[PDB]
Design a protein around this ligand. Structure first.
Ligand SMILES: [Cl-]
Lengths: 233, 239
């Protein structure tokens, strides 16, 4: 199944950014967040695998092989929200984040980041991304905390030969409070063309780097479970 | 139209911040226990509450498209809204069609399914409704709703179809669905002539769907209008 499933997915899915403008920062931010929420609610998510109560789902759209991972972590959702919404700290737990640079603090809950990523799948250059991150605290009615990521273009931050400029359409974290010191943590990625080989390898079960990274995510949250620094920034 | 989109986006942020602390069951009777000994008053109160909501003086007209109107009331504990249009159907027939909650899934995508739980009397019934997951959720919602319908007492008065959440020992919350509550919703229908009816839908407080309400009210989405349009086409198809 594995090798064959991988090759089928590759054959199916082989071969996204929006211009940023200060005059539409509020709308772009809404759309960033709203897109992630809508992705969560799509009706055709299918469980691909489970390993140690951690679940990997896919959505095989006509355009995209979307995936998401879910786990339950013994950390407070508000704390998980501050820890995960600071993308500067993501290189610490996520190997796929080689570096992170804050381009533009847009407001309290929105920022543009320059992200670089190690090359994977034969490339002799790393990838880079210019990403709008938009975070929202929910109403206390059971809605999730949301940290939404989508690629944006800026006249000053176009691609240079140092990196393959990639794009991500709709990615990020949702966190649902499940109890005192219990959070359901999910990471979603709708479409990131430049890493499809890597996705299909993971989704088919030839690799478990997604599981490994999500384990390091949990450990990062637990290790920083009770840090005050996030809430005082 | 960038400017107008930016305004909408700002309005949603304002509203969301304003109601970020949801109204609780201790503060307002989002649901009430179903008590068959009190069935008469429970239905009376359901109708009277919707009549009072209608008569509130602080409704503000927030938008209009094709002479369909969306009003809002930014109350202190919750954000109430109501939609209003006039349809080329007899009020008496609209009354039968809109009181039949089991038919509501045919025109309202928010009603995924409806089960009649108890017919209390000719004009009052309790239903179990399921609703599709909105953005940010993976489980559908369910509700247990008392629907009480009344004809107009005098001329000028509306037909009233009042909905309010109730609880029952046979339909307690289950892990399969996120249980929602509605405080006071439903339809008022006024005769505007021969086969003209003013059709209004009201929703005082459904705290579980706040984000969806703010998106629509802010004008970033038009799903309220799309559903109300389908409502119209349902009524026209069923004359
Ligand atoms: Cl959910």
């Amino acid at each position: 199944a594995s090798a064959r499933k991988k090759i089928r997915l590759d054959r199916k899915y082989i071969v996204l950014s929006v211009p940023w403008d200060p005059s539409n920062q509020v709308y772009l931010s809404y759309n960033n967040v709203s897109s992630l929420k809508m992705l969560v609610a799509k009706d055709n998510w299918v469980l691909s695998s489970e390993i140690s109560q951690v679940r990997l789902y896919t959505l095989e759209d006509d355009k995209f092989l979307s995936f998401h991972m879910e786990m339950v972590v013994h950390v407070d959702a508000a704390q998980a929200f501050l820890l995960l919404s600071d993308l500067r700290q993501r290189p610490e737990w996520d190997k796929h984040y080689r570096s992170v640079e804050l381009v533009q603090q847009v407001d309290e809950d929105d920022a543009i980041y320059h992200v670089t990523s190690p090359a994977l799948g034969g490339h002799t250059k790393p990838q880079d991304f210019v990403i709008l991150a938009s975070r929202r605290k929910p109403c206390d009615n059971g809605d999730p905390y949301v940290i939404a990521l989508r690629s944006v273009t800026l006249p000053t931050h176009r691609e240079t030969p140092e990196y393959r400029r990639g794009e991500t359409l709709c990615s990020g974290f949702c966190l649902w409070r499940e109890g005192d010191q219990l959070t359901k943590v999910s990471y979603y990625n709708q479409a990131t063309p430049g890493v499809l080989n890597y996705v299909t390898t993971n989704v088919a079960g030839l690799s478990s780097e997604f599981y490994t990274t999500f384990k390091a995510c949990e450990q990062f949250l637990l290790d920083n479970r009770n840090d005050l620094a996030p809430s005082l920034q």
